[PDB]
């Protein structure tokens, strides 16, 4: 198998190589010779075969190598979880750290070798989870030995083990392996025949919408633009059916499709201007399911914690979905991998967050718990911001600023009208959304400017950003709360409508002068 | 470009080869060395690159070569068509015969090189038509010079030229290279939401019948089974509308669809057992529009020839349609291409057949015409049998024998009853249909057995086939005519009812023991 095949391969490669050299030579001395030429050709082909045979054999060498190390790490992981005393536990992790690393290398190898990108993604995703959890399993399984009466800890340890076991299998599964979608799909229509097989590849493969999980506007917009392009496709399939044979150029009918089909591809640009906006219709409030999910457990409340798991979990994955929708549309693979990977890790760091809350809700005094939470908290936010920053790039920074401009405008007035309606519950709420999108805008603008060389362009932009967050925003928040303390205190002190409006306007305008500075 | 690149390629291949040899060596003396090993690997990869670079360059050499020869044959073909005197004409064909051949070789080269099979098919199809027509163009364009007042000849010559021009382009087009429908449709239903978008993709896309262009039975059968499955779909769309959300398993309602929808897919199997039967309800009589369409023109009858064009043309295309219906249902692409292609060629060889008859009907003595017809006749039948054999495979040989069993039975009795009714016009007619389906059965049975290894199974089958065509059939035909000469001769000689029935029964039985032998 191993060495066996190798020597054998070296042979074929050696022999064919010699015959190729001579042939190549005889051709060099007589390049204007047709025969001597053909000889060189056949020779080249023969060389290819010998060379490839070695590559294939070489692939086995790598695969096998991956297997050996894979099985080693498998047992090691289970041995770590089953550790009973801190002595054995510490001993296992040390003998596993290297084994894990080695496998990590070998994994990256097959990852590249795997042809179809799909499997390649699985390999990297599996490798990641494996790489991240291995250390965590140690910390989890360790806690169970210090507090054997904390089912919460045991449950966590096992969940990590589960994910780890998954990764290992995923590596082997992908090791046996051997893009956008609307882009490549739209490029298919041009022939004087078979209108029956094209009508099926353009019909049954052009019916995949999505929508949902967005605000009412995004649903409406998507509904209108999706119907306008569906009709478009049918105008292309009903008008095209009249070309026949000789119409192999561009007349009134063939172009009746070329003007409808070639232009209506807009649906794509519609779903984008419809998704990228989620970033401000349910984002910045990223801490919302953590800075309370923790406070619950941190207060010895085992009840409002169980119910919060779903609440937390819900807002989380919902965010990842939109991140995926951003992947469906984006021929950018390098960036899709980033997003899809950042999503996987963050998708795997989910159960851990819950386990933490569980162990803390039962022991809001256990310094080990309060620290375990604090630690997990840090890792969750850290993994969130990245997935977020990874996505902010999968899209157009500029487009983001555009949608943020309109939406900001909407919520801004929602507050202004709330100030008039003297509805604090709304005044507060709306104001918050304003602070959200605003900051979400300053972060994306700045994080995107790190790819540009400092200068007039970067200066005029950051300044516009500095103002909105340093001068603007504060004066507005100062007015929001100022209004609140004018109806909940005593009967109801008179609110200064003026300053509130002008202050709030600065917010919107601020975004405007930043967007304008971004373009320039 | 050519030689230029070559010498260059030989270099990279030469240098890399040397470095590879040494590396391979150092590894041989120390195979247990990891470093020396890696070296060998990197070396192997480097060799691959040098080798490939040569292959690519080599591809150009072949492509270019194809181009040169392609342009040569192009002009030659046009020069042949424009020939005015038998002198120049004969001269061109001779200087083209070789040019054509050379290109034929070069074409076969790129054909293999082309990666995607699709283009590969085009290359072969284009090459074929080019190979076949080149000689024909000569015979056609030649006739026009001997009888300049025969538009029929001119029209033919040009059509050949058109096809030839097509092939050439098709070769160059493919040289730049590197599904079913009911099957994929039925696999769509499984989700706790959006019952409004699924109801439209399962309703508006499940309404495409056909029927017609068959005997009364095939229309009735199709009508019954199409209505039984239409109702079925509505039992799936009316019962499904009650799953809601939690019903994500398989209860009484969700399965009320799973038992109706999952079983009624039979409509498909109905349209098949309804189409494959055409093969004996309007086939074998394939010569019928030729062995008379010719006799007409061959008798200097320019009148019954014009009217026969439509008659001939009608029976032809009708046959192709059914061949297409056999394509709609058959996920087999490789076979569909065959059928669809065999149909195209035969669909293009149609106008030519007519042109022949036209030129002969006007000159039933012109040895040039009588030969042109004889030639065209051969090509039409040849292209027919193939399209036919191509289709006989797109279906189930066994199923064909089944339907042939029932239909034979019907026509058989139609004759027996005709013998009793003493209706010769029917006796003759029916008997013919019997001889048709019968032979159509023996050919399909034998042509299908060429895919099986000779032995007991093949023996017991062919014999059953041999009997039906050697012993059976004859004794029956002998009785049919024998009965005819028993009422048209003198007043009406007494017919021997006995022998006629027994003889005719052999026909049916013959088919039975062949079908049974096919199964076994």
Curated annotation (Swiss-Prot), chains A, B:
Membrane-protein topology: Peripheral membrane protein
GO molecular function terms listed in the Swiss-Prot or TrEMBL record: actin filament binding; beta-catenin binding; cadherin binding; gamma-catenin binding; identical protein binding; structural molecule activity; vinculin binding
Keywords: Acetylation, Cell adhesion, Cell junction, Cell membrane, Cytoplasm, Cytoskeleton, Isopeptide bond, Membrane, Nucleus, Phosphoprotein, Ubl conjugation
Annotated stretches, region: Interaction with alpha-actinin: 214-283
GO cellular component: acrosomal vesicle; actin cytoskeleton; adherens junction; catenin complex; flotillin complex; Golgi apparatus; intercalated disc; lamellipodium
Main localization of the protein described in the UniProt heading: cytoplasm
Region described as Involved in homodimerization: spans on this chain: 1-144
Role noted for this protein: Associates with the cytoplasmic domain of a variety of cadherins. The association of catenins to cadherins produces a complex which is linked to the actin filament network, and which seems to be of primary importance for cadherins cell-adhesion properties. Can associate with both E- and N-cadherins. Originally believed to be a stable component of E-cadherin/catenin adhesion complexes and to mediate the linkage of cadherins to the actin cytoskeleton at adherens junctions.
Complex formation: Monomer and homodimer; the monomer preferentially binds to CTNNB1 and the homodimer to actin. Component of an cadherin:catenin adhesion complex composed of at least of CDH26, beta-catenin/CTNNB1, alpha-catenin/CTNNA1 and p120 catenin/CTNND1. Possible component of an E-cadherin/ catenin adhesion complex together with E-cadherin/CDH1 and beta-catenin/CTNNB1 or gamma-catenin/JUP; the complex is located to adherens junctions. The stable association of CTNNA1 is controversial as CTNNA1 was shown not to bind to F-actin when assembled in the complex.
Protein known as: Catenin alpha-1
Originating species: Mus musculus
Gene name in the database record: Ctnna1
Full protein segment contained here: 85 to 631 of 906
């Amino acid at each position: 198998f191993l060495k066996e095949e190798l020597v054998v391969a070296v042979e074929d490669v050696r022999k064919q190589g010699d015959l190729m050299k001579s042939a190549a030579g005889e051709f060099a001395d007589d390049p204007c010779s047709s025969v001597k030429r053909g000889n060189m050709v056949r020779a080249a082909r023969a060389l290819l075969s010998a060379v490839t045979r070695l590559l294939i054999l070489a692939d086995m060498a790598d695969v096998y190598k991956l297997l050996v190390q894979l099985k080693v790490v498998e047992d090691g992981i289970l041995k770590l979880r089953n550790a009973g005393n801190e002595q054995d536990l510490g001993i296992q992790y040390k003998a596993l750290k290297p084994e894990v690393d080695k496998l990590n290398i070998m994994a990256a190898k097959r990852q590249q070798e795997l042809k179809d990108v799909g499997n390649r993604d699985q390999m990297a995703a599996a490798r990641g989870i494996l790489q991240k959890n291995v250390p965590i399993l140690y910390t989890a399984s360790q806690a169970c030995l210090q507090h054997p009466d904390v089912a919460a800890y045991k449950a966590n340890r096992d969940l990590i083990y589960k994910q780890l076991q998954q990764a290992v299998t995923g590596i082997s599964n992908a090791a046996q392996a051997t893009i956008v979608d609307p882009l490549s799909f739209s490029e298919e229509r041009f022939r004087p025949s078979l209108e029956e097989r094209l009508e099926s590849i353009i019909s049954g493969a052009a019916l995949m919408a999505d929508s949902s999980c967005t605000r009412d506007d995004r649903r409406e917009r998507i509904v209108a633009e999706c119907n306008a392009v569906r009709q478009a496709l049918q105008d292309l399939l009903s008008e095209y059916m009249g070309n026949a044979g000789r119409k192999e150029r561009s007349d009134a009918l063939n172009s009746a499709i070329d003007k409808m089909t070639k232009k209506t591809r807009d649906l794509r640009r519609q779903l984008r201007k419809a998704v990228m906006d989620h970033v401000s219709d349910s984002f910045l409030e990223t801490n919302v399911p953590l800075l309370v999910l923790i406070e619950a457990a941190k207060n010895g409340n085992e009840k409002e914690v169980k119910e919060y798991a779903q609440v937390f979990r819900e807002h989380a994955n919902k965010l990842i979905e939109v991140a995926n929708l951003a992947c469906s549309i984006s021929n950018n693979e390098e960036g899709v991998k980033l997003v899809r990977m950042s999503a996987s890790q963050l998708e795997a760091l989910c159960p851990q967050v819950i386990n933490a809350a569980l162990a803390l809700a039962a022991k809001p005094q256990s310094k080990l718990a309060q620290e375990n939470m604090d630690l997990f908290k840090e890792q969750w936010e850290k993994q969130v911001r990245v997935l977020t920053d990874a996505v902010d790039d999968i899209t157009s920074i500029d487009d983001f600023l555009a949608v943020s401009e309109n939406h900001i405008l909407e919520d801004v007035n929602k507050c202004v009208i709330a100030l008039q309606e003297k509805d604090v519950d709304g005044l507060d709420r709306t104001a918050g959304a304003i602070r959200g999108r605003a900051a979400r805008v300053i972060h994306v603008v700045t994080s995107e400017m790190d790819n540009y060389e400092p200068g007039v362009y970067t200066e005029k932009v950051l300044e516009a950003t500095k103002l909105l967050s340093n001068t603007v925003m504060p004066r507005f928040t100062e007015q929001v709360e100022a209004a609140v303390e004018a109806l909940s205190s005593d009967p109801a002190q008179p609110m200064d409508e003026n300053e509130f409006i002008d202050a709030s306007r600065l917010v919107y305008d601020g975004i405007r002068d930043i967007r304008k500075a971004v373009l320039m």
